[PDB]
Structure formats: structure tokens, C-alpha cells
Design a binder for this molecule. Structure first.
Ligand code: 68E
Ligand code: SAH
Ligand code: MG
Ligand code: ZN
Ligand code: ZN
Length: 845
């Protein structure tokens, strides 16, 4: 009797209750919530049709099967394996066959990326089909049975059916029962002929001994099968472990043109950076022809140790003082952040490895005119300026590694050498990391300095301040954003629109880049030449480092791209604000009927009409906007803007979470308008004065504060408590939790570490000063929208949101557990105080 047979007898003896516990004990599982609701609403983009896409991805990620050419998918069902293959580098056609009909899954039609190369056929019994030529054979057929010999016949049947479909090609075949001796005998003969190996997918439930015969591998079937039997037997006795939750796959949207995908690198511009990386890592430098990059040019890899983690570190002090939130899913989903090479690669494939169609010639003309006008407007008072070593060094001080480098003369000597290459129109070492010795660290910081030197002026000199740019909100700060949205709401016209671009930085075109670059025209000759090196050699020819996991260990890939924004490069905020202002002006012109479909298609479009609209209405239309990077709030002259989608989608600025051609929905109540991850409420204090306050789902606030020595953990907790008291004092639970943290953390301990990296954060809470004096300075004294300067002497006079509004935005007020928490607060304070030690603490309400 095999171990698998012992496992089967035990599984069949389990009661219904203990079977439901065991089946998912310690397993990996994708969260199907979003996809199931999306499919229920009839959505055809992004969603995977079943858990199958995730299941196949696990194999593909690990190079166990690398689908390519003509893919055939036997028993495709709903199509999860097929729609996943459709977006892979080397796949040119996916033919899926499934039985369908009563008791069988039918193919679910979709518009995910590459749907156009997907051919799902129902009414196809694979056991009646003559084998076809194919480059990848996939098969996921096998119905379970309490009898293992019934499964044995089903498994041999599938094995005999698949075999003739194999001829030196890729495969991934389910083996329903691999533990029966005759199945092992059959697999051993199959491995001698076709190779491959048997692998267990962790996403498989414990109620099945299924394994997959994959083409890329070798190894001992008997040993691999028994290891699974042993794991599965051990899971019966093992104390119940909840499944490891992973984020489900994003299969994108739209048609795939395989010939449009590849990147053609400018080797004359990037060749030297590749040569130097190759030199520094010559001992492990290799060219991996099995790399997954479709739209990024690949140049080689080097071996590296793995960096990252599946989840975030939890803050113990704040968790202890926020007990009702242990049970809330959104709070724990915050900690769900996969930064492993597997996590990086998933994000790269779904978000970065895309190509935006060139905008039409009329769209390019409109953008060119708007850009020339906008830079002139932005440069009316200020002149561009070079930033310096002294400036960069000051900014760094206000990483310990960065402070060491800037104090080192060798770092500056390397910078000078690279600057001399930039002056000759050459780049030798300027690279950025998507996610991935001191020479490498110095080359990176030097790249960031040289970008800062040439383009730091846009941020440093406040080019996107509301005063300089009209639409900008730079230097404003969270507490001022709402007051600006309230002021914009006073402008008559349409609703306030707030459409987010799906991954903005990947939607930045070679045309956007050429328009952003136009600022060089206002620079002095020596500045012009340095900024022109950045734009041309580095921003329009990006050389990037990215980690990738392989069956033999982690590698660092060197990849390149001409278009898109370099997210790991300086000036991203300012360049995004500039292009978003321009794109929003173009969409306003279309909504006004100034810019037509005929204009967008016109190769010899006339500037006259656009120039008149900009010179006469431009600044007025800029004033109708609040633009902060990729994020915008637009209040147009009327609602035609909602239906104005031609120039927006043609520019490549496709809106997130909405079909391409569906009109936008806006708001007339400014307090419901989303902006920079927040919405803003207008409150009336006990004294009758009004306050405009920042707000967001309370679980996002708690969840974030719950992410990380003890002293550092307590100090970071205190920083979150003080930010809450200054910015989110109107949230009942946050003021109570803030008071609890400050009582539990030593009073003289000055908060350390940032609570956020937001450009809108001025960190007035990073102090030992009394929080009510800081509150008064922020909310009354320095507040330009507060006319009456009378201070507030008590927190009782610092207002809360209305009970219903506090509840709508996630408050737990009115729940029994929240009431128990409030009663149990002095106890939670004592527990943290006990752990910290015998220090000086104070009591807060
Ligand atoms: C516009 O203001 C904010 C926006 C965001 C996004 C954050 C913020 O970090 N949020 S986060 O931690 O949960 C988060 C982290 C990383 C990525 C995210 C992506 C989307 C949404 N959140 C993300 C903080 C602030 C501020 C907090 C306090 C402020 C103040 C003041 C007055 O001086 S400003
Ligand atoms: N004789 C047969 N011919 C064709 N398809 C069959 C079959 N016997 C079973 N099937 C189908 O095989 C499917 C297995 S489930 C397919 C899951 C899939 N890999 C995904 O990603 O969604 C079932 O839907 C079943 O209807
Ligand atoms: Mg927005
Ligand atoms: Zn360089
Ligand atoms: Zn709110």
C-alpha cells in the first residue's frame, strides 16, 4: 500500500466539517472576490475567468512550462489557462477545446489582453479528436472519485490521449492520481520518451493528490509523488493553518499585435551603460534567451541573491491598541505586499510590459501647440536653473548610506566624470531600478544627482505651485487640498471630474517626452546641454535593472525602453503634472467642440483655432483644475467633457476601471470628489466657524499605521498618532486610538521615521510640541481660509465628522466590539507600557 493510498483512505473517512477544514489547510489561494463580482456584473477585461489563470501562472513563473507558438489547451473549460497564455511573449495562437454541455464548464468570452488570438471551442470531446501539431500542449482534465482505481483508469486514459499530441514541445498535463502504481509505471515510460517531471502546485487543495507533468525539468517521479503523499498525510494531524492569500492575476485588456510588441533599442545611446554593467558583473553575466520581456529590449543578466518578502512587517504597539481591527479584512490586506522577484515579475508583466499606440497626427499637433503654450505660461516669471551639489547634499540629510556618499569626495569625482560624458552627448553609467559593491550604489546616486542637477528646478523652485501653474497644488499640503476643491466648486459649469489613468507612467508616449523636453528652450546654454543629455540619453532611452526568479536562482535583468516614464528617475511628479495639465486642457477643448474627430485625424491640422482658445481661455481653463502628478480634478464649462473621450484615449491616457468608450461620471458635491487618495468634508465647529478636513476609508488609515527594536516601533506608532491628531482628528476612532498611543509611548520620546512619503505631507506632527498648539497653528493661524484667528483652548472644540459620515467612511462606532475596545483602552495602554519598561508616560482622553 502506497502513502497516497493511505492518504485516500483517511480523506474518505473525514466528516463533512473536518474535510472542509483540511482541504484548505496551509494551501496557497488567490483572492477571487474582485474577479467573481466583476464577472457577475458582466465585465470582460482584467479578470481571470477562473482560479486556473493563477494556477498556470505558478508553473509559467517557475519556467516549468513556457507557452510558445501555437498553444493547444485540452479541457479548457471557462478558459483560464487560454486567456493567460494569450499575453505571453512567444504565444501566437491559442486553440482551446472543451466538452461543455450539462455538468461541464463552458468557455466564458473575454476581452482580456490577446483575446484576438484566443479560439475557445465548446462541444469538443478531446477523447474523439485526432492529435494536432502544436508548440505547447496543455491539459487540465481529471474528475475525482472516492475510489482510487476509478481515478487510475481516468488518469491512464488522459495519459494515453495526450501522449500522441507531444513532439519536442512544451506541456503541462494534470495527473489526477499520480500515486497508483500503474500510473507511476506509465509516467516513468512517458518521461523516458518525452522528458519533463511531475510537480505539485501549492494552489491545489489538500483534498486532491493531483500533480502536473511539465516539460521543463527532470527528476524522480516516485520520490516527487511520495513527498506529496507525506505532506498531505502530515496536513491531516497538523493544527489548522489558514490558506496563504495572494492577489489574483490581472490579464489586461485589448487586442494584441505580436509584431508591434518588440522594442528596437538605440544601441549607440545605451551600449556603453550595458558594457559597464557587464564589466562590473562579468563573473555571472549571461544572455538568457528565455527572458519574458515583450515590449522592453533585453540585454543580459547577472546572478544575484533574492531581495523582498511576500508580506509587510506588523507594528506591535499599534496592533495591541487597535484590537477590533484584527478581524477586519481591508486592514490586513494592507500588509499584503509581495516584493519578491516573483511579485516584481507579476507587476512588470501586467502593468509595465505594454506598448501604447502612437497618437494620431492631429492629436500630436494639438499636444505640441498646448505644450509650447504651457511651458511659456509656466516660465513667465521663473527661469529654469541648474541645481547643485550643496542643494542635493542638504535634501539627502533632511538613507544613512546616501549621507555617507554625499560626504565622500570620491562620489562627487565620479559624478564629475559622468557629467563630462553627458556634455559630449554620452552616458556611461546612468541606470535606474524597476525593483532590484559601493561603485553600483555610487553610480545610482550619481545618476539621481545628475537628473536633479538638470531638472530638480521644477520641484525646488515650485514650478507647479498653484501661483505659478494655476492648476498645480505643489507646496499646498493635504489640509489645503480640500479648501482648493471647495473653491474650484464655486466655478460655474459642469460637474467636477476625477478620472484616474490606469498606470499613468506606462502611458507616457515618445510624443509626451518630446513635449516635456521643450523646457530646454528656456535654459541657459550650459544648463540646456546638461538637461538635453538627461532627456535624450536617459529618459528617452532608459536602461533598467529588474529581478527575476529562475529554477536555478535569482538573476538581475538589464532591460531598456525608449518611451514611458522612468518611475525610478528624478522629476516624475513635475513631468507628470505638466503632461496631465496639457492632457486635461486637450480634453476640455474636445468637450467645447474646438477639437473634433476630423482634427485628430488631420495630418496637416491648423494651429490658429487651438492658439486662439489657449490665448483667450487657457489660463481660465487651468483654474478649473487641481492637478497633482497623474491625479486630476477638472470642473469643465459644461458636461460635454464626460463624453469627450477621443483625444484622451488617443493620447494614451486610458481611464482606470471603466470601459474605453463609456462616459465619465463626475460629482457636483465637492465633498465626494476623490483626489490624492482622499475626499474632503466641510465641518462646522462648536463656535460656528467652518473647517475643511481631509478624509479617507478608516481601514486604510489603521492598516497603514499597523505597518513597521520596540523603541522604533513605539516611536513610529506615536508619529501615526500625532499625524491623526493633526489631520484626522474628526475621526472618532482615530482620535481615541491617537490618545491611546500617546499615553502608551514615553512622553519625551521624539517620533522617528516618516508616516508617509506624500509630496502633500509637511509632517507638522513630527514634534514634541503640544498637539493642540500645532493644531491651532495649522488650522487657525496659518490657514488662509480661516478669517477669524481666535485660538481653540480645548480638543472638545476640535470637531468630529457627523456620526453617519464617520460610519460611511469606515468608523466602528455603534459596534459592540468598538465599545468593548473603548472600555479596554486603559488596559491596552498598560500592556504597551509594561513592554516598553519603567519610563515617563502621560494620560490622554
Ligand atoms: C495627499 O496626502 C496623502 C496621500 C497619500 C497617498 C498618503 C499615503 O502615504 N497613503 S498610504 O500610506 O496608505 C500609501 C502608501 C504607498 C502607496 C499608496 C498608494 C495609494 C494610496 N496610498 C498609498 C498620505 C498622505 C498624507 C498624509 C498626511 C498628510 C499631511 C499633511 C499636512 O502637512 S498627506
Ligand atoms: N472529454 C473531455 N473533453 C473535453 N473537455 C473535457 C472532457 N472531460 C472534461 N472536460 C472539461 O475539462 C475541464 C477541466 S477544468 C479546466 C480549468 C482550466 N484549466 C481553467 O483555467 O479554467 C472541465 O470544464 C470539463 O468540462
Ligand atoms: Mg483622481
Ligand atoms: Zn549618464
Ligand atoms: Zn470621509
Amino acid at each position: 500500500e502506497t502513502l497516497g493510498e493511505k492518504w485516500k483512505k483517511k480523506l474518505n473517512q473525514l466528516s463533512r466539517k473536518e474535510f472542509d477544514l483540511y482541504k484548505k489547510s496551509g494551501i496557497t489561494e488567490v483572492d477571487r472576490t474582485e474577479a467573481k463580482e466583476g464577472l457577475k456584473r458582466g465585465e470582460t477585461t482584467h479578470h481571470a475567468v477562473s482560479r486556473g489563470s493563477a494556477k498556470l501562472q505558478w508553473f509559467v513563473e517557475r519556467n516549468m512550462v513556457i507557452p510558445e507558438g501555437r498553444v493547444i489547451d485540452l479541457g479548457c473549460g471557462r478558459g483560464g489557462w487560454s486567456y493567460y497564455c494569450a499575453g505571453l511573449k512567444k504565444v501566437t495562437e491559442v486553440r482551446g477545446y472543451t466538452k461543455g454541455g450539462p455538468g461541464h464548464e463552458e468557455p466564458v468570452p473575454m476581452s482580456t489582453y490577446g483575446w484576438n488570438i484566443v479560439k475557445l471551442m465548446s462541444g469538443k470531446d478531446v477523447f474523439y479528436l485526432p492529435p494536432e501539431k502544436c508548440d505547447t500542449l496543455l491539459c487540465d482534465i481529471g474528475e475525482s472519485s472516492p475510489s482510487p482505481t476509478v481515478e487510475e483508469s481516468r488518469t491512464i486514459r488522459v495519459l494515453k490521449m495526450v501522449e500522441p499530441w507531444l513532439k519536442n514541445n512544451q506541456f503541462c498535463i494534470k495527473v489526477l492520481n499520480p500515486y497508483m502504481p500503474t500510473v507511476i509505471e506509465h509516467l516513468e515510460r512517458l518521461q523516458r520518451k518525452h522528458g519533463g517531471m511531475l510537480v505539485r502546485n501549492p494552489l491545489s487543495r489538500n483534498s486532491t493528490h493531483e500533480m502536473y507533468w511539465i516539460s521543463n525539468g527532470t527528476g524522480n517521479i516516485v520520490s516527487s509523488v511520495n513527498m506529496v503523499s507525506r505532506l498531505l498525510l502530515n496536513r491531516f494531524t497538523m493544527t489548522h493553518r489558514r490558506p496563504t492569500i495572494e492577489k489574483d492575476v490581472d490579464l489586461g485588456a485589448g487586442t494584441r499585435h505580436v509584431n508591434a510588441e518588440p522594442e528596437t533599442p538605440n544601441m549607440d545611446v545605451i551600449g556603453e551603460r550595458i558594457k559597464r554593467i557587464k564589466e562590473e558583473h562579468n563573473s555571472t553575466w549571461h544572455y538568457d534567451d528565455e527572458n519574458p520581456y515583450k515590449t522592453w529590449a533585453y540585454h543580459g543578466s547577472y546572478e544575484v541573491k533574492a531581495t523582498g518578502s511576500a508580506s509587510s512587517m506588523i507594528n506591535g504597539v499599534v496592533k495591541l491598541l487597535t484590537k477590533p481591527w484584527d478581524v477586519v479584512p481591508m486592514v490586513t490586506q494592507m500588509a499584503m505586499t509581495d516584493t519578491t522577484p516573483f511579485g516584481q515579475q507579476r507587476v512588470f508583466k501586467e502593468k509595465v510590459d505594454t506598448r501604447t499606440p502612437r497618437p494620431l497626427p492631429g492629436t500630436r499637433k494639438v499636444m505640441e501647440i498646448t505644450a509650447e503654450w504651457l511651458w511659456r505660461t509656466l516660465g513667465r516669471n521663473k527661469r529654469p536653473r541648474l541645481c547643485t551639489r550643496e542643494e542635493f547634499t542638504k535634501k539627502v540629510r533632511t538613507w544613512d548610506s546616501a549621507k555617507a556618499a554625499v560626504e565622500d569626495e570620491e562620489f562627487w569625482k565620479l559624478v564629475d566624470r559622468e557629467r563630462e560624458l553627458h556634455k559630449l552627448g554620452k552616458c556611461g553609467s546612468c541606470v535606474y531600478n524597476m525593483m532590484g559593491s559601493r561603485a553600483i550604489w555610487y553610480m545610482w546616486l550619481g545618476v539621481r544627482y545628475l537628473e536633479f542637477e538638470a531638472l530638480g528646478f521644477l520641484n525646488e523652485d515650485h514650478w507647479f505651485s498653484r501661483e505659478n501653474s494655476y492648476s498645480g497644488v505643489e507646496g499646498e499640503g493635504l489640509h489645503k487640498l480640500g479648501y482648493i476643491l471647495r473653491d474650484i466648486s464655486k466655478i460655474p459649469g459642469g460637474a467636477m471630474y476625477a478620472d484616474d489613468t490606469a498606470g499613468w507612467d506606462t502611458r507616457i508616449t515618445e510624443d509626451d517626452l518630446h513635449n516635456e523636453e521643450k523646457i530646454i528652450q528656456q535654459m541657459d546654454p550650459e544648463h540646456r546641454q546638461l538637461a538635453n543629455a538627461i532627456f535624450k540619453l536617459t529618459y528617452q532611452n532608459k536602461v533598467v535593472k529588474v529581478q527575476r526568479p529562475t529554477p536555478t536562482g535569482t538573476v538581475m535583468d538589464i532591460i531598456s525602453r525608449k518611451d514611458q516614464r522612468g518611475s525610478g528617475q528624478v522629476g516624475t511628479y513635475g513631468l507628470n503634472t505638466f503632461t496631465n495639465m496639457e492632457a486635461q486642457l486637450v480634453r476640455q477643448m474636445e468637450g467645447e467642440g474646438v477639437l473634433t474627430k476630423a482634427d485628430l485625424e488631420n495630418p496637416h491640422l491648423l494651429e490658429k483655432k487651438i492658439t486662439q482658445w489657449l490665448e483667450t481661455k487657457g489660463v481660465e481653463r487651468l483654474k478649473r483644475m487641481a492637478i497633482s502628478g497623474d491625479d486630476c480634478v477638472v470642473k469643465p464649462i459644461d458636461d460635454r467633457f464626460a463624453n469627450a473621450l477621443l483625444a484622451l484615449n488617443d493620447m494614451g491616457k486610458v481611464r482606470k476601471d471603466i470601459p474605453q468608450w463609456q462616459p465619465s461620471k463626475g460629482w457636483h458635491d465637492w465633498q465626494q470628489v476623490p483626489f490624492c487618495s482622499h475626499h474632503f468634508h466641510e465641518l462646522i465647529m462648536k463656535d460656528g466657524r467652518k473647517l475643511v478636513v481631509p478624509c479617507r476609508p478608516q481601514d486604510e488609515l489603521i492598516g497603514r499605521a499597523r505597518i513597521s527594536s520596540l523603541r522604533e516601533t513605539a516611536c513610529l506608532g506615536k508619529a501615526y498618532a500625532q499625524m491623526w491628531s493633526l489631520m484626522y482628528f474628526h475621526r472618532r476612532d482615530l482620535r481615541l486610538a491617537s490618545n491611546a498611543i500617546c499615553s502608551a509611548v514615553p512622553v519625551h520620546w521624539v517620533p522617528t521615521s516618516r508616516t508617509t512619503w506624500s509630496i502633500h505631507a509637511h509632517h507638522q506632527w513630527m514634534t514634541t510640541e503640544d498637539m493642540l498648539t500645532v493644531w491651532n497653528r495649522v488650522w487657525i493661524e496659518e490657514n488662509p481660509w480661516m478669517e477669524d484667528k481666535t485660538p481653540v483652548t480645548t480638543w472638545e472644540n476640535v470637531p468630529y465628522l457627523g456620526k453617519r459620515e464617520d460610519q460611511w467612511c469606515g468608523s466602528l462606532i455603534g459596534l459592540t466590539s468598538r465599545a468593548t475596545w473603548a472600555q479596554n483602552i486603559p488596559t491596552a495602554i498598560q500592556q504597551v507600557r509594561s513592554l516598553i519598561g519603567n519610563e515617563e508616560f502621560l494620560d490622554y482622553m
